[PDB]
Amino acid sequence: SADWKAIGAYILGFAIPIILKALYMLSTRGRQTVKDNKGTRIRFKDDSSFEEVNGIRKPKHLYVSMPTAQKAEEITPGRFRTIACGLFPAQVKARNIISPVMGVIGFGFFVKDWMDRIEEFLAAECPFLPKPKVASEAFMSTNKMYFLNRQRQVNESKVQDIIDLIDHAETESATLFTEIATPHSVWVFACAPDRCPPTALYVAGVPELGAFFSILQDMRNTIMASKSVGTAEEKLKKKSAFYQSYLRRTQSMGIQLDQKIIILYMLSWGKEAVNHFHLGD
Q1: Residue ranges covered by each domain of the chain
Q2: Which uninterrupted H or E stretch holds 272?
Q3: Is the CB of residue 169 less than 8 Å from the CB of residue 8?
Q4: Can you tell me the distance from the alpha carbon of 242 to that of 213, in angstroms, rounded to the nearest whole number?
């Protein structure tokens, strides 16, 4: 599907404020800016985005295509959100841009002390590494060790287009990361990308983090559904499949998710995450 290399190169040529401006709009006010838009493309502008040509400043506009309906280069709002939440998560955090879709499963509170959480999680013993016995190999039986194993494993599943994208972004204004225990790794999902962002696909345990959030979404949906006025069917018929969606789309990028990591996230963090769902009112 999408040519993430080409799309990213285009987006990486703009000033950070206009990119984030459009990322804010399409994440929060998504369906309405499309409905309200006169014609063929969505045009974005911002005083940070210009070209000096030469005695005169010419504004430089960010275009995202209208998404009706049916190829590789085109920057739909979905592709734009997916790409940009991966390229600029430090800036997303700095501006505190959180999609309502993520806001209602309590993303804001969840990430509040992210570094402490992810370090606690990685320093914990991993139930899929047998077995400490001798408490001096203890460094070999931690989740962190499991993630090192995983990192070397996914390294085998890399596609060139995304390798190219990552390499290009590092020389630009992207705020990429290579490890999960960084302040900004979790912020690639703040705008509710419909799949793991391209540039994050090969950081161990990060695409599984997206899956974790997607399951919380389904969990919230299940909880909201039980207490809502429901043709007894139309309750089951307009259910949600966020996880199956995220799963299908992320794995279509040429990686298989580590289900065991997904299980460790859900069982480590699930209980307290549910306590921060917006239900609903």
Answers
A1: 84-274
A2: helix 259-274
A3: yes
A4: 9
| Residues with Cβ within 8 Å of residue 255, at least 6 apart in sequence | 154, 157, 196, 201, 202, 207
In the three-class reduction of DSSP (H, G, I as helix; E, B as strand; rest coil), residue 181 is classed as coil
Angle between helix axes 259-274 and 206-226 (nearest 10 degrees) is 50
Q: Are the C-beta atoms of residues 200 and 188 closer than 8 Å to each other?
A: yes
- Distance CA(277)–CA(226), nearest Å, equals 15
Burial class of residue 6 (count of CB atoms within 10 Å of its CB; 0-12, 13-18, 19+): middle
Distance CA 103, CA 99 (A): 6
What is the structure's resolution, reported in angstroms to one decimal? 2.2
Residue 103's alpha-carbon distances to 19, 28, 149, in angstroms, are 21, 10, 32
Q: Phi then psi for 159, rounded to 5 degrees?
A: -110, 145
**How far is it, in rounded angstroms, from Cα 64 to Cα 167?**
23
**Bridge partners, residue 204, by sequence:** none
